[PDB]
């Protein structure tokens, strides 16, 4: 629902989702063949499922086609410094794709907003929903649309008949946390084809033995995982598959 929904939010108030007490596989998110741009710093895009972390912070918002290059640490612009700042130690994983067939319509889709003016910079990982009129001079205006007072929040220009560099791109960032705590969500070991009657090596969560897997004729009780024998040797392990 974070990816496929009926509508999204803006950049001044974006959706914040936390993944806790869950397990997922990042292999389906790589072979989708539907994303436009895919950048992932801090870790390789193909070896991030083995090593896992404590928490996963995912934010979803909309952005134009010419601003997808601004989501990176080490540059200054208009959106990456007033809406969402990227720190130096940013080990995130950004994913973007083009879905102009849902967030655009004839007549002009101006549903989402953005912040253009701001007094100063902001600390990264901080949301700004201040709708106060940014004063550029030294005299008050009592919130009027006259001189020396402009509204920072401005509308969009989304149109489904545009080109490529000005289309609404669904951009998401998957950040990881590193603290003194167990992994709330971790990348699990992938399964492998089942093979028997051959000299294989398996690791069924409690041992790493080398041998064959013959079909037994005895059924175990549905509360055990391993099995010993008379000679005190674990030679019967239930397959969790």
């Amino acid at each position, epitope marked *: 629902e974070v990816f496929n929904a009926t509508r999204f939010a803006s950049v001044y108030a974006w959706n914040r989702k936390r993944i806790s007490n869950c397990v997922a596989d990042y292999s389906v998110l790589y072979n989708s063949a539907s994303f436009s741009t895919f950048k992932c710093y801090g870790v390789s895009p193909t070896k991030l499922n083995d090593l896992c972390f404590t928490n996963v912070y995912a934010d979803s918002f909309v952005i134009r086609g010419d601003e997808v290059r601004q989501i990176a640490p080490g540059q200054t612009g208009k959106i990456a410094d007033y809406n969402y700042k990227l720190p130096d130690d940013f080990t995130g994983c950004v994913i973007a794709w083009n879905s102009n067939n849902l967030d655009s319509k004839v007549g002009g889709n101006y*549903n989402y907003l953005y912040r253009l003016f701001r007094k100063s910079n902001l600390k990264p990982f*901080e949301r*700004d*929903i201040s709708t106060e009129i940014y004063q550029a001079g030294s005299t008050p205006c009592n919130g009027v*649309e006259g001189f020396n007072c402009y*509204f920072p*929040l401005q509308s969009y220009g989304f149109q489904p008949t545009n080109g490529v560099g000005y289309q609404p791109y669904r951009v998401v960032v998957l950040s990881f946390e590193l603290l003194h705590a167990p992994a709330t969500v971790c990348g699990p070991k992938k399964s492998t084809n089942l093979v028997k009657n051959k000299c294989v090596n398996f690791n069924f969560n409690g041992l790493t033995g080398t041998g064959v897997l013959t079909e037994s004729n005895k059924k175990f009780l549905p509360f055990q995982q391993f099995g010993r024998d008379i000679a005190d040797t674990t030679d019967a392990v239930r397959d969790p598959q």
Partner: antibody, heavy 123, light 111 residues
């Protein structure tokens, strides 16, 4: 400032209701205005919030496309239109004001509220 | 909906009475601030405390708000003759794409 609303109003089950929100003074054409309802029996819901400067609608996903909220800059008022009423619409609406701030949370708060409009529909 | 509350809470006029707000890890535990309101049966609700760190104008300092991880708490000291109302827990939900209120607890003496 103080926001005044209309009194009690009844309608037909399947017609349109026309209420308004008046503002006394200023500080209405610079901040966002939302509508919060309340019905005896359950909690408080939130239909959506409308900005008067840009005139952009922002509703929720739980409410379908059946209510429209407009804004006016000439007299600084807002109107509410809701047709095809049901038997659950017996509640009261409030004309609230939002004042954003900065911080790690940045949640929408309702510092200024309205009076209330009792809208009861039945046979 | 996604926010639950106890239906009633008992207290004594002179002790500390606390309440808890429990939700999910995407609306309150994600990092969003919580807002507490008071629903008096006979007038419009007003603002009591925003962000659990600041104090608005016109409210007493007896209300204390805190956020312990994924749950918010409200603590009061002393029961006066104006606490016959309902307390609601409001937080911004991303799955609902907007603000959602809580259930509401009743705290009053029948007398």
């Amino acid at each position: 400032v103080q926001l005044v609303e209309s009194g009690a109003e009844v309608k037909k089950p399947g017609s349109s209701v026309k209420v308004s929100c008046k503002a006394s003074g200023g500080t209405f054409s610079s901040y966002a205005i939302s509508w919060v309802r309340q019905a005896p029996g359950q909690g408080l819901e939130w239909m959506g919030g409308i900005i008067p400067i840009l005139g952009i609608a922002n509703y929720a996903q739980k409410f379908q496309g059946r209510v429209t909220i407009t804004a006016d800059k000439s007299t600084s008022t807002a109107y509410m239109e809701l047709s095809s009423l049901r038997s659950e619409d017996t509640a009261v609406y409030y004309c609230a004001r939002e004042n954003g701030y900065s911080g790690y949370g940045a949640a929408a708060n309702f510092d200024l509220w309205g009076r209330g409009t009792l809208v009861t529909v039945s046979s | 909906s996604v926010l639950t509350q106890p239906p009633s809470v008992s207290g004594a006029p002179g002790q500390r009475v606390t309440i808890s707000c429990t939700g999910s890890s995407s609306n309150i535990g994600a990092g969003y601030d919580v807002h507490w309101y008071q629903q008096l049966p006979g007038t419009a609700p007003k603002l009591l405390i925003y962000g659990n760190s600041n104090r608005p104008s016109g409210v007493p300092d007896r209300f204390s708000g805190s956020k312990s991880g994924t749950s918010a708490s409200l603590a009061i000291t002393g029961l006066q003759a104006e606490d016959e109302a309902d307390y609601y827990c409001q937080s911004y939900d991303s799955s609902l794409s907007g603000s959602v209120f809580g259930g509401g607890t009743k705290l009053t003496v029948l007398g």
